[PDB]
Design an enzyme around this catalytic site. Structure first.
Site, PDB file in Angstrom:
ATOM      1  N   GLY A  12      62.370 -28.254  62.567  1.00  0.00           N
ATOM      2  CA  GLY A  12      62.936 -26.918  62.677  1.00  0.00           C
ATOM      3  C   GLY A  12      62.023 -25.707  62.753  1.00  0.00           C
ATOM      4  O   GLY A  12      62.506 -24.579  62.623  1.00  0.00           O
ATOM      5  N   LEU A  36      71.941 -25.256  66.853  1.00  0.00           N
ATOM      6  CA  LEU A  36      72.119 -26.297  65.850  1.00  0.00           C
ATOM      7  C   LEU A  36      72.481 -27.656  66.470  1.00  0.00           C
ATOM      8  O   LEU A  36      73.268 -27.730  67.419  1.00  0.00           O
ATOM      9  CB  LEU A  36      73.222 -25.869  64.875  1.00  0.00           C
ATOM     10  CG  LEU A  36      73.065 -24.485  64.226  1.00  0.00           C
ATOM     11  CD1 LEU A  36      74.358 -24.096  63.515  1.00  0.00           C
ATOM     12  CD2 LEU A  36      71.902 -24.488  63.252  1.00  0.00           C
ATOM     13  N   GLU A  37      71.886 -28.720  65.936  1.00  0.00           N
ATOM     14  CA  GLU A  37      72.175 -30.080  66.393  1.00  0.00           C
ATOM     15  C   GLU A  37      72.926 -30.731  65.243  1.00  0.00           C
ATOM     16  O   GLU A  37      72.319 -31.175  64.265  1.00  0.00           O
ATOM     17  CB  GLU A  37      70.902 -30.882  66.666  1.00  0.00           C
ATOM     18  CG  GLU A  37      70.121 -30.473  67.899  1.00  0.00           C
ATOM     19  CD  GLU A  37      69.224 -29.288  67.650  1.00  0.00           C
ATOM     20  OE1 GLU A  37      68.693 -29.182  66.524  1.00  0.00           O
ATOM     21  OE2 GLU A  37      69.036 -28.475  68.579  1.00  0.00           O
ATOM     22  N   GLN A  56      69.444 -22.605  56.133  1.00  0.00           N
ATOM     23  CA  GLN A  56      68.586 -21.509  55.703  1.00  0.00           C
ATOM     24  C   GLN A  56      67.344 -21.418  56.567  1.00  0.00           C
ATOM     25  O   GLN A  56      66.928 -22.392  57.192  1.00  0.00           O
ATOM     26  CB  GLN A  56      68.132 -21.708  54.255  1.00  0.00           C
ATOM     27  CG  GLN A  56      69.238 -22.014  53.270  1.00  0.00           C
ATOM     28  CD  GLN A  56      69.004 -23.324  52.548  1.00  0.00           C
ATOM     29  OE1 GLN A  56      68.878 -24.375  53.172  1.00  0.00           O
ATOM     30  NE2 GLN A  56      68.949 -23.268  51.227  1.00  0.00           N
ATOM     31  N   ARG A  96      73.890 -33.528  51.327  1.00  0.00           N
ATOM     32  CA  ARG A  96      74.370 -34.481  50.323  1.00  0.00           C
ATOM     33  C   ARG A  96      75.593 -35.258  50.804  1.00  0.00           C
ATOM     34  O   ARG A  96      75.960 -36.260  50.201  1.00  0.00           O
ATOM     35  CB  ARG A  96      74.690 -33.772  48.996  1.00  0.00           C
ATOM     36  CG  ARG A  96      73.465 -33.265  48.243  1.00  0.00           C
ATOM     37  CD  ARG A  96      73.794 -33.004  46.774  1.00  0.00           C
ATOM     38  NE  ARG A  96      74.710 -31.879  46.599  1.00  0.00           N
ATOM     39  CZ  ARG A  96      74.334 -30.604  46.574  1.00  0.00           C
ATOM     40  NH1 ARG A  96      73.050 -30.285  46.707  1.00  0.00           N
ATOM     41  NH2 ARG A  96      75.249 -29.652  46.432  1.00  0.00           N
TER      42      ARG A  96
HETATM   43  O1  LIG Z   1      67.608 -26.174  67.688  1.00  0.00           O
HETATM   44  C1  LIG Z   1      66.736 -25.411  68.062  1.00  0.00           C
HETATM   45  C2  LIG Z   1      65.804 -25.681  69.149  1.00  0.00           C
HETATM   46  C3  LIG Z   1      64.864 -24.766  69.491  1.00  0.00           C
HETATM   47  N1  LIG Z   1      64.732 -23.530  68.834  1.00  0.00           N
HETATM   48  C4  LIG Z   1      63.679 -22.495  69.217  1.00  0.00           C
HETATM   49  C5  LIG Z   1      62.387 -22.769  68.451  1.00  0.00           C
HETATM   50  C6  LIG Z   1      61.319 -23.054  69.487  1.00  0.00           C
HETATM   51  O2  LIG Z   1      60.164 -22.237  69.291  1.00  0.00           O
HETATM   52  C7  LIG Z   1      61.955 -22.715  70.833  1.00  0.00           C
HETATM   53  C8  LIG Z   1      61.748 -23.879  71.776  1.00  0.00           C
HETATM   54  O3  LIG Z   1      62.303 -23.682  73.060  1.00  0.00           O
HETATM   55  P1  LIG Z   1      62.086 -24.747  74.297  1.00  0.00           P
HETATM   56  O4  LIG Z   1      62.925 -26.133  74.083  1.00  0.00           O
HETATM   57  O5  LIG Z   1      62.348 -24.005  75.746  1.00  0.00           O
HETATM   58  O6  LIG Z   1      60.485 -25.099  74.240  1.00  0.00           O
HETATM   59  P2  LIG Z   1      59.413 -26.302  74.004  1.00  0.00           P
HETATM   60  O7  LIG Z   1      60.234 -27.690  73.733  1.00  0.00           O
HETATM   61  O8  LIG Z   1      58.475 -25.890  72.714  1.00  0.00           O
HETATM   62  O9  LIG Z   1      58.487 -26.509  75.338  1.00  0.00           O
HETATM   63  P3  LIG Z   1      57.039 -27.287  75.180  1.00  0.00           P
HETATM   64  O10 LIG Z   1      57.191 -28.688  74.338  1.00  0.00           O
HETATM   65  O11 LIG Z   1      56.577 -27.634  76.725  1.00  0.00           O
HETATM   66  O12 LIG Z   1      55.953 -26.308  74.428  1.00  0.00           O
HETATM   67  O13 LIG Z   1      63.398 -22.458  70.621  1.00  0.00           O
HETATM   68  C9  LIG Z   1      65.605 -23.181  67.759  1.00  0.00           C
HETATM   69  O14 LIG Z   1      65.549 -22.119  67.139  1.00  0.00           O
HETATM   70  N2  LIG Z   1      66.572 -24.167  67.434  1.00  0.00           N
HETATM   71  O1  LIG Z   2      68.695 -33.699  48.290  1.00  0.00           O
HETATM   72  C1  LIG Z   2      68.537 -32.636  47.719  1.00  0.00           C
HETATM   73  C2  LIG Z   2      69.437 -31.495  47.819  1.00  0.00           C
HETATM   74  C3  LIG Z   2      69.174 -30.350  47.143  1.00  0.00           C
HETATM   75  N1  LIG Z   2      68.042 -30.195  46.322  1.00  0.00           N
HETATM   76  C4  LIG Z   2      67.743 -28.911  45.556  1.00  0.00           C
HETATM   77  C5  LIG Z   2      66.936 -27.962  46.439  1.00  0.00           C
HETATM   78  C6  LIG Z   2      67.772 -26.710  46.610  1.00  0.00           C
HETATM   79  O2  LIG Z   2      67.033 -25.534  46.277  1.00  0.00           O
HETATM   80  C7  LIG Z   2      68.941 -26.864  45.639  1.00  0.00           C
HETATM   81  C8  LIG Z   2      70.231 -26.605  46.385  1.00  0.00           C
HETATM   82  O3  LIG Z   2      71.388 -26.725  45.586  1.00  0.00           O
HETATM   83  P1  LIG Z   2      72.895 -26.355  46.138  1.00  0.00           P
HETATM   84  O4  LIG Z   2      73.452 -27.452  47.214  1.00  0.00           O
HETATM   85  O5  LIG Z   2      73.912 -26.056  44.876  1.00  0.00           O
HETATM   86  O6  LIG Z   2      72.691 -24.926  46.917  1.00  0.00           O
HETATM   87  P2  LIG Z   2      72.790 -24.197  48.370  1.00  0.00           P
HETATM   88  O7  LIG Z   2      73.294 -25.293  49.473  1.00  0.00           O
HETATM   89  O8  LIG Z   2      71.294 -23.610  48.737  1.00  0.00           O
HETATM   90  O9  LIG Z   2      73.883 -22.979  48.323  1.00  0.00           O
HETATM   91  P3  LIG Z   2      73.799 -21.799  49.474  1.00  0.00           P
HETATM   92  O10 LIG Z   2      73.677 -22.431  50.984  1.00  0.00           O
HETATM   93  O11 LIG Z   2      75.227 -20.983  49.345  1.00  0.00           O
HETATM   94  O12 LIG Z   2      72.512 -20.818  49.182  1.00  0.00           O
HETATM   95  O13 LIG Z   2      68.917 -28.238  45.087  1.00  0.00           O
HETATM   96  C9  LIG Z   2      67.108 -31.263  46.164  1.00  0.00           C
HETATM   97  O14 LIG Z   2      66.098 -31.201  45.463  1.00  0.00           O
HETATM   98  N2  LIG Z   2      67.422 -32.442  46.890  1.00  0.00           N
END
Ligand SMILES: O=c1ccn([C@H]2C[C@H](O)[C@@H](COP(=O)(O)OP(=O)(O)OP(=O)(O)O)O2)c(=O)[nH]1
Ligand SMILES: O=c1ccn([C@H]2C[C@H](O)[C@@H](COP(=O)(O)OP(=O)(O)OP(=O)(O)O)O2)c(=O)[nH]1
Ligand SMILES: O=c1ccn([C@H]2C[C@H](O)[C@@H](COP(=O)(O)OP(=O)(O)OP(=O)(O)O)O2)c(=O)[nH]1
Lengths: 175, 175, 175, 180, 180, 180
Positions: C132, C144-145, C163, C122
């Site tokens: 993701g 994370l990016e 999450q 937001r």
């Molecule tokens: O921000 C990120 C980026 C990647 N990953 C995890 C998920 C994914 O399954 C794996 C990907 O790793 P890598 O970049 O080595 O593989 P790839 O791009 O899937 O290779 P290819 O396209 O040749 O299958 O790492 C994350 O959790 N967060």
């Molecule tokens: O653009 C948006 C942003 C949020 N939501 C909804 C989905 C989500 O389930 C809830 C999230 O509300 P909040 O920002 O109060 O919660 P949170 O960021 O999930 O808190 P936490 O990370 O501590 O669990 O509102 C939408 O529908 N659209």
């Protein structure tokens, strides 16, 4: 398991999934098209500190808005130029918060994901920065994060802006 | 329910899911890697008005392209500098539309989501602005929305650019 | 089928899904909140060429970091201004790589998707550029990016940043 | 969820589910038809005590068999009467064990259920007396327990005797052991 | 996955699953109760040979029927005794065919399973002798095979006789044919 | 979808599914084995009329029981013969009600199916005559309907008698009532 048109129609009919207002013509093969509200929010603080209450300005448009990429360098003249050329009511650069007209209520066995429309994505306009998953049990309208990444884009009041993809949960949730 | 490698292989074999061209080596644990086409599209209008026909330029590269963040301020000299230094055929800033080489056809019981490659995401290069869900019944190649958010990124013709995650629908769709 | 709070708790308990460290208070209706690590990576090369080894700088913060949109034009004075005004330890513009504190291990029948927090979305702050999705069988922390698209955003060490949404696979994967 | 014809075809094609012999025309909307083998087993004990290996006789019919309800009282005179009047190779009464011609192998993510065919159930002929669920990982032919509950029923060698209903498991199962 | 009461209601409402007549109060936690029709069929042949059309008699009870186990030996004397002592319209022994009052239509993504009710199973009365799975795409009433395995049981016209368990298919099934 | 061993373990651990007593080694690839209680019920009425409360006798065996098929004609002479020759505490014929030692509780998102074990089905011994699906929300032990269809079968106290197959519901079910 993603709900198909048949399931969406059933869930709305029995009120398992609430969608107000609802138009059956918006039901796609496996999603539901939502529309853009006429109310927007523009933050007016120097930086975003979630530990503090954010200051903002509430904007309401009559028909359309022109969303420009950040640092588009909008001057008085440019704005007037855009308004007269494209008949837009408001011109903004950078991020702007919007909302769907549709208010929803999700049951404890359904999670939904919002995604910006494909036709808008093709012109580099996004209405959501995150994946868009919404918790089961959620109630309310969908907040939109609108940003243009290539060139200014015109958005219209009540136009389809994205879709909701509904997914079944493996088990009911406790909220 | 997301299809695993075993399911993808079965669906392609029986032609429930069409993927042309297809390489079994691209089948991952629960996704299928798609590749970047050599054809791109660059819009050349002042603003994006979806109520009108958009003007664009069709670009075809031989080997690679350099994608720069918007407002990178590309001059004649900078472009020549990049071409000679990185051997790229074309240099663009801002948004550019691309396409996967793979043409797909999805059955009425399957929805697919396209996501940009993780290795590219780590260098802030995205090939899709939206969540990427594709309707059951869809036919065609996947359009890519390429944008660099940190520094210029080199992309290669035919390189893996992302993946398709396939999900089962709760019921068959009517399209 | 997306796992609900009940399923997440079961899978973690039997070690089908590994999450270290784990806090039951982070379990939501159908997701699990992860937190931001204190280590970040900033690339220092002119362009991103995945065919080469990337050069970078490893940054570790004590409490917080200020993430500014690209081309924010950060000068010595501006940085000092931000540090003294918002008590941030480090100020960066453009893309920055971070990591969740949580280390995870996914079984062969589960795929997970990471999405940046809604409260941050937001304020136009994203911690992931792609959809993701994470392959079944995956092991490791989540990269994370982080990019700000409207105005500078303050991030805190160990704060909830996003999450993990867990989904069942239609069949077990071969990795 | 129950596998439809399309799923059964995919699983057999990739050998996720083994079926030998396999007849593509035995694939129904959401099951696979199986056929009656020509070998039957008849127990020969006063009572059945599972702690022991029961005594039995192995018979092999050429074409058909007449299964009579229990206590039908089949005397040599009656038996020859049926064999001549209906041309059945064998005449039995009470419970008789049979087998499907089909040999199957189930993966760790599939459980199958056997059910005798409806057309035979319509004449009170059953080839199973329990629900008939089969564990994931199972390998082998299907044992049949044949009993007639009204009048004698004629069964033929290789005829379709029942169907296998395949269902997906919520998660992969530990089949009981592993090999490396 | 098995359809819960909420799913059954949705599918009937949109006509994805047809049930005629439909009684909303027959919807249980995860099944739909069906009732006993007043028409029964009794076969009249020495043995059952499926190659032929079996001879039978069609009876229609006014209110109730007494189903006796096979070999109960019902003589005119005994029959009149039961009819007078329990006021049953008909007395039969052995297997008897019945039908549900309900007519159903299943879509290409649903398979249903019929099961006789537990309360009757508790008195050894069965209205089916096979698993009872029904193919997706099925259209029609449910044929019942009624047999008493202990003592005679009294059944009443229109009483709840069993339940239908609805399960989703993994994929849409080819019902066997198509029309254009 | 059917719960595999891993799912059964998770659900019992978090008490989503209650099973008392619980034996981790009774968890199979995709079911849970249940055992035979030592208390049985035998009806004592000429015919079964569900409008009334049926008369019955409650017996409790010390170790084993011999279940004979209906119409086996058990005279005092024959009964003493079996008891002495096989050392069974009780000898019965026809249908007999039993119970599982296990008490279960099912959540609103799970439905379970009971099936008598295959090893006993192989000797024509059944502990249920209907499909055996149990409603989500059910609380209690499993009632068993035991019948031998060929020869007398010896059953032992506490032996594994059958299995429970757990399946997920498409959606949470309304169990029939709620409390606040
Ligand atoms: O921000 C990120 C980026 C990647 N990953 C995890 C998920 C994914 O399954 C794996 C990907 O790793 P890598 O970049 O080595 O593989 P790839 O791009 O899937 O290779 P290819 O396209 O040749 O299958 O790492 C994350 O959790 N967060
Ligand atoms: O653009 C948006 C942003 C949020 N939501 C909804 C989905 C989500 O389930 C809830 C999230 O509300 P909040 O920002 O109060 O919660 P949170 O960021 O999930 O808190 P936490 O990370 O501590 O669990 O509102 C939408 O529908 N659209
Ligand atoms: O980058 C993209 C964009 C779109 N599509 C596919 C998926 C989607 O199902 C379809 C959308 O086409 P279109 O833009 O004509 O439809 P729409 O925006 O869904 O119309 P509406 O919002 O009125 O339902 O094309 C892709 O594969 N890749």
């Amino acid at each position: 398991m993603i709900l198909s048109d048949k399931d969406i129609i059933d869930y709305v009919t029995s009120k398992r999934i609430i969608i107000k207002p609802f138009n059956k013509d918006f039901v796609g093969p496996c999603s539901y098209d939502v529309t853009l509200g006429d109310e927007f929010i523009i933050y007016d603080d120097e930086v975003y500190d979630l530990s503090k209450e954010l200051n903002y300005k509430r904007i309401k448009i009559k028909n359309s808005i022109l969303v420009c990429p950040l640092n588009y360098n909008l001057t008085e003249e440019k704005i007037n130029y855009f308004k007269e050329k494209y008949n837009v009511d408001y011109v903004v650069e950078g991020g702007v918060l919007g909302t769907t007209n549709e208010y929803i209520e999700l049951p404890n066995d359904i999670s939904a994901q919002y995604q910006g429309r494909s036709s808008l994505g093709r012109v580099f306009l996004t209405s959501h920065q995150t994946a868009g998953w919404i918790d089961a049990g959620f109630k309310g309208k969908i907040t939109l994060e609108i940003v243009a990444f290539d060139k200014p884009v015109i958005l219209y009041k009540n136009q389809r802006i994205g879709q909701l993809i509904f997914s079944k949960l493996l088990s009911p949730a406790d909220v």
